[PDB]
RNA sequence: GGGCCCGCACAAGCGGUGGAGCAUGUGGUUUAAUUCGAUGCAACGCGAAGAACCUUACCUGGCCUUGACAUACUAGAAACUUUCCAGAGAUGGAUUGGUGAAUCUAGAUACAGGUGCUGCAUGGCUGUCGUCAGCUCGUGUCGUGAGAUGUUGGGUUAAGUCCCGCAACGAGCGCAACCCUUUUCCUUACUUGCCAGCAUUUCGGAUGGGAACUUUAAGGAUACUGCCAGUGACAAACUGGAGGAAGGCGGGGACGACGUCAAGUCAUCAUGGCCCUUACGGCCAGGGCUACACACGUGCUACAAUGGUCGGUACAAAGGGUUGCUACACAGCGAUGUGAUGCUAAUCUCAAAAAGCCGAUCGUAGUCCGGAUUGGAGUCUGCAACUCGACUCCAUGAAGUCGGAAUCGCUAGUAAUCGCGGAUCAGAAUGCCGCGGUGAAUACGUUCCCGGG
RNA sequence: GUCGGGCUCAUAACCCGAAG
RNA sequence: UUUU
């Protein structure tokens, strides 16, 4: 059975991180995986006016990105899974897993 | 600037590859609306090659020496619309035509600035 | 602002907490095609006769530290001049300022 | 040539032409000259008899010149008497749809005025 | 002036933020709601502790916050009845089972943030201004760091018109993106009013990015 | 005898696929003129091949996404002689002083904070 | 105008009052605070003073004002002159 | 006050504004009230990233007192949940289900409470000069000394940038670089995205498959006068041209020194102080901010043919979407309505890009220009569209035929133009912020105008 | 002469336009 | 050319 885990962060050196320890997690008891493939960001955008009063041009540009990484492993054992689970996610980084 | 600055180059239309005719309707052009310039233009060549049997390329270059560079493409695209005859690419093909015969629309258009002399 | 109005939005939001499931239903038997019409006369009248601020369409988003009721990101629940500060300071994800 | 009492231009297209009724714009007119059956591109100096009195026939269905005139200025009159607010504002010359007054109304309230 | 803030233009370059979580773009601001409130008690709280920061995380829908402080024994004391119970008074405010740990700050003199707290408990005890942030900077730059700014603006001690000093002895580079820069800002609640006190601490350039 | 250029000139992307057989064109499964009304954009798509004068030499299939009229001609221009010049290397000189060779950089400036249109700024008002 | 599938629109403090002066045949006016009702053919004959920000007008709902909302015969702006 | 230098400061060009219709902010006036703030540059589509009620602070009336909410004290009751009426509503009444902590009620004392005043008592934040190039220190030298030097001069430069001179030699903060983006290439990653080469093709990557290519998003390479010529003072620098995807700071953005303007803001917040406490506090329903003899600012739309209308056919990027976007079907002229469908999204949708190209049409006019304005009939949001919404259809078809004195923005993918998106938001953008499409002309020069070192 | 605009950080002058 |  398919185990398509998709993760999902703020920061991608955080998610990036957190894929290439998961990787080689499973590939040390196991097989066919097909890596970590970066999926397009969303990357949404605000503008505060930074003055209490009244300055229409003066104001703070900001950004926040979520970055999104998805990982097949196609056909895992029995000995794969569990340890899957059993691996301790970092904050910052949502994992999701759906079986196919 | 202040100190100086170069020219910038445009490049040969890619029907002739004459770089004067392409300044040329980098005059009539206006808006960004290259494709209505070069349509008027060609047409403008295209009429006055078929009567007035001429190489179009070695014909506007042989009457605009009779109107002075920019200058005189400004007075021939102004004075190529106050005639209200047909569409612009007759218009400026016309007004050529009255330039090489030597009228007084554009051939002696500029006439006022050497009356001035 | 001053606390009368934030007591104020408590007060209208709830109140729509409480008429929420009623609203919804009266809603849902107006828009009705399989209904009697005697039925899509009642549920108008009864509706209407709610309290004013029964209906969200009164509500208005405020900061979720002073109140102000103008320059809302529902993106944070916070006004602007709150966010800002805290953008600054580090204690938001994922925020920083924007260049590109 | 003479349709609903009006001199419609001659030497131009018939929806264009017949769209000088006060009454019929281009809507209008592509509904008489389609329920007709006379296409749009016919210029009107070409038009037989035999078809002016059938298109005659068909503004005569439509509110044209003089009632059509007089109903609009009767709605207005109505409105005037019952002297409820667009009312009042039609007896000022101000805009009565709800437009900005602080400017921007020349039009109701005609040009500029000085001191 | 009209300057950036040193910590919010160094946030994706070299600096860390003091929040760590994820939150799906209509359950954002509940998360961030929850974490501002708990920041903004801790630090009563914890106010005549040392601390000089807070740290959220939110791992997979969980609580844990990390506090950076001074002294580790103000706010255990008697160990097995605040950290165990600080964790019960926190998750009624996280709303989440929250845990708490310790973050022994040694060299505890590189922190702005404590700077500030130094020199403006100093303000509100009358002492003189001046010997006060000199005093402090005395205090900083023995400690290791290679640069101190300590700015100081308001009816100083009471008069009657405002104005602004600053002391500056090092190195301080603020457009250097690259320079671990610390910064803190703190108001002294004088009988008069209000001393704002800024203090600038930097430590040597960071290099090799994150 | 198949040879491969990917040419960017704005948002364009050109990926031109050349090889040698008669003169045959198709652009996005469409023919040449098919494609460019504006027969210019056929004239600077022509560009390159017609300056080496071949024109007859080589087929060209072609699969462009983005940009507009002019955008994806220099896009296909560009992507047709950078397979060209990976075939028969020592054309790149001539293609190299018509300037059929160099990847065009401006893309469009961004918007500003506080302008109208990128250098466009408010029209200033004293008193 | 509202649409004519939610039919027309009419408070139910104004309207009891008029149903409850209908069977009545009052000639006391119905002093109302509304000025959003729309003015029905129950309501010819009546008179209703209704609000207009500081005083209550009372209009005699006459035939050709169906259609109207309360509001509407109550000029709530004062304006005689700018001179 | 001189001198030099610089900078769309002027010049040359391109386009606007001042003219006309409307949108919007201000002044005034008006008014019950038209809430307050912001006044040259640096206020005037400004706080407001969205006034129908609410927001709301103002006016009109109608109501409340430990007060809508903090804690400190006393007593009976689990929080609760129904249902009706008077009422414009607040407000009250009247009824059902539940049986030491809590959550209202009752009371009293401090107190709460004010968007009231002072930004000239303050902080915290911002404009502005101005991304302007400056601001200092240590030693060493000169001046009884304060001080000076350095930091000046010839050049140069975007630059206290660099060089050469020189009683200065160094150093720091500013400059630059470190940061983000865009341009070329590489390594990885191959799905939801891709289709080069095979076949299956229901002609649609659709479907097997392939991991090439585009793309996608992580880690890197490249550019540095490096190379040659020339001018130059064994100089910096500058002019090339070769190479190169890119050449000289390749393009943009963020970052805004020391200080000035008692610049802005007690109406974000906080705060010292002063004032109010049956009201300047709290709660309501209607109005109002939407007024209109007029005056200004900033915009949107046009006056036509390089155009209008109608038909046919292309090509974007970037954003949004579960109370949301909705394939498709049915109804309507349409706005939309009903069923119906996938989607928590590189998967489904918004969504059609427009200007462009092709064909006809109009033939230089107040017109098939232009849409103001008005009458008529609707749709949706909403508890309600009168005051005071947006949109849709029919009719209606003003002004306006390129605009005075004057004046503004712009040096390259820019001005000019063409459309798309979001934030705020139930609905309400010509405003703001972004996105891409097409795509110029000119710069002789510093005498002047304007701001600075 | 007046009134509206232009001009200046602010004034007239001056320029324009209008009414008379 | 009038005022700081
Ligand atoms: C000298 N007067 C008039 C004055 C007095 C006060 N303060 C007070 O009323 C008294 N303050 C107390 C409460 C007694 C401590 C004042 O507070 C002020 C001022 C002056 C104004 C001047 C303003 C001026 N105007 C023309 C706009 C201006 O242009 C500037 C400027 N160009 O910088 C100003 O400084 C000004 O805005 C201003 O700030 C003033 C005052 O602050
Ligand atoms: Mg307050
Ligand atoms: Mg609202
Ligand atoms: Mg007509
Ligand atoms: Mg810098
Ligand atoms: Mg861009
Ligand atoms: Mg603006
Ligand atoms: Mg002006
Ligand atoms: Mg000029
Ligand atoms: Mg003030
Ligand atoms: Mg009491
Ligand atoms: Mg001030
Ligand atoms: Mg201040
Ligand atoms: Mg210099
Ligand atoms: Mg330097
Ligand atoms: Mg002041
Ligand atoms: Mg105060
Ligand atoms: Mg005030
Ligand atoms: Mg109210
Ligand atoms: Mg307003
Ligand atoms: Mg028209
Ligand atoms: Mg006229
Ligand atoms: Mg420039
Ligand atoms: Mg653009
Ligand atoms: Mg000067």
Known sequence: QRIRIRLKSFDHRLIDQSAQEIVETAKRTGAQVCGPIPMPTRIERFNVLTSPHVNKDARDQYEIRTYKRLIDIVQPTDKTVDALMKLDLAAGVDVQIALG | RRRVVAAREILPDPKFSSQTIAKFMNHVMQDGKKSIAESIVYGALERVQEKNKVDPVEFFETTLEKVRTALAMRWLVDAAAKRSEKTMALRLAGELLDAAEGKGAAIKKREDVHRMA | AKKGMINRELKREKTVAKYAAKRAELKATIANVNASDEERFEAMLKLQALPRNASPVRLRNRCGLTGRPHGYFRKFGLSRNKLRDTVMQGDVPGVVKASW | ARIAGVNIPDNKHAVISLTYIFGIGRHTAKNILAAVGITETTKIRELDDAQLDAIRAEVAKVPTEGDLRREISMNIKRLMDLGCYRGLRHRRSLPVRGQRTKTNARTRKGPRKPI | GQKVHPIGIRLGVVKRHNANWYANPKQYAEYLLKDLQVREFLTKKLKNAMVSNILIERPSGAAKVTISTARPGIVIGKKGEDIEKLQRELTNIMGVPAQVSINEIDRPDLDARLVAEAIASQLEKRVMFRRAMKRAVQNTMRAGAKGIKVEVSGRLGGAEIARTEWYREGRVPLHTLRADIDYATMRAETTYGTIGVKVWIFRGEILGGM | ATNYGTGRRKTATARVFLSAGTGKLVINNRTLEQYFGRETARMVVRQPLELLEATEKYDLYITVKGGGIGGQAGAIRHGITRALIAADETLKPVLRQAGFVTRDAREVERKKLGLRKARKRPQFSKR | ?83
């Open chain 7, 1 to 83: 105008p509202r649409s004519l599938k939610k039919g027309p629109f009419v408070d139910a403090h104004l309207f009891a009052k008029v149903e409850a002066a209908v069977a009545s045949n009052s000639r006391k006016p119905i002093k109302t605070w509304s000025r959003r009702s729309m003015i029905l053919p129950d309501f010819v004959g009546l008179t209703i003073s209704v609000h207009n920000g500081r005083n209550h007008v009372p209009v005699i709902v006459t035939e050709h004002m169906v259609g109207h909302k309360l509001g509407e015969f109550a000029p709530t702006r004062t304006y005689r002159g700018h001179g």
